């Protein structure tokens, strides 16, 4: 009967990187989605398979909240059926995804004048991710018809890079915080409802 902890998901001080995105299960509470849609902070509030104004009515099972930080011109890749670096190698959404992608500009929270280098994204993978698959395998891979035997062949590549977030940086490169709410629709007794 108490409130679901949306305060501990959205207003958190530290978000994880997109290659190691945080997943929070939400269960055994009541969720008030009307504060999320009516808040003026969220630039992107795109719901697939539900309507944002109707979210106070449906009872759900085990709502997942996926929190991470990407750049501005990659928020379009947090959507079903998109292609990019984030969709292929960092965070994949299923084609039948029923949820809401929420994103707000956090330039004045996640940037430093020397560069906030604590946020990371995977540049390349041997294959695309499955839907909702987290790959934190921080290896060093090889490409170019020489193995990663050493420096004597062609050199090896490191998959994770850091966004060098700056305040001076133009929009589209500024840190955007993304929370992906994923719903599972009424397979069991539902636990999270609306008031």
């Amino acid at each position, epitope marked *: 009967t108490n409130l679901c902890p949306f305060g501990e998901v959205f207003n958190a001080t530290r978000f994880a990187s997109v290659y190691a995105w945080n997943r929070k299960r939400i269960s055994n509470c009541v969720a008030d989605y009307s504060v999320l849609y009516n808040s003026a902070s969220f630039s992107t509030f795109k719901c697939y398979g539900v309507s944002p104004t109707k979210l106070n009515d449906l009872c759900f099972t085990n709502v997942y909240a996926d929190s991470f930080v990407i750049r501005g011109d990659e928020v379009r890749q947090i959507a079903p059926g998109q292609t990019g670096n984030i969709a292929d190698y960092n965070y994949k959404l299923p084609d039948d995804f029923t949820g809401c992608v929420i994103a707000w500009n956090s330039n004045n929270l996640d940037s430093k004048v*020397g560069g906030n280098y604590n946020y990371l994204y995977r540049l390349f993978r041997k294959s695309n991710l499955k839907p909702f698959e987290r790959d934190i395998s921080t*290896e*060093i891979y090889q490409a170019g018809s020489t193995p990663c035997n050493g420096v004597k062949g062609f050199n090896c*590549y490191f998959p994770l*890079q850091s966004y060098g977030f700056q305040p001076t940086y133009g929009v589209g490169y500024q840190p955007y915080r993304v929370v992906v709410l994923s719903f599972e629709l009424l397979h069991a007794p539902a636990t999270v409802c609306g008031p």
Partner: nanobody
Amino acid sequence: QLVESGGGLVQPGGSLRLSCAASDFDFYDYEMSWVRQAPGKALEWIGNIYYSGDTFYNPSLKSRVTISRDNSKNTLYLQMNSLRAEDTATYYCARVESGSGWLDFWGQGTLVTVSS
């Protein structure tokens, strides 16, 4: 001509410092990384230091490895403590490209062996 030092033989109860020097290019805005190659294994990534002294470490080696840099001295410092017998390797300082993950190994590599 860039050189390196600090690599020798060391007991598994202590620590070591490793240094990469830089010459004939600017050691100002590059993203540098420390990797190692064990004998008979692949190259293992130890960590990297970014611009403005921010570090990202291997999760297996988070509590034993510290990486620093000095752009005025044009040097790259690794310090590693509580060493194990498997930690023996050839250690390489590399430069990470931006946008491509290409490691630019211009160091010759330092040989570190541990025993009693």
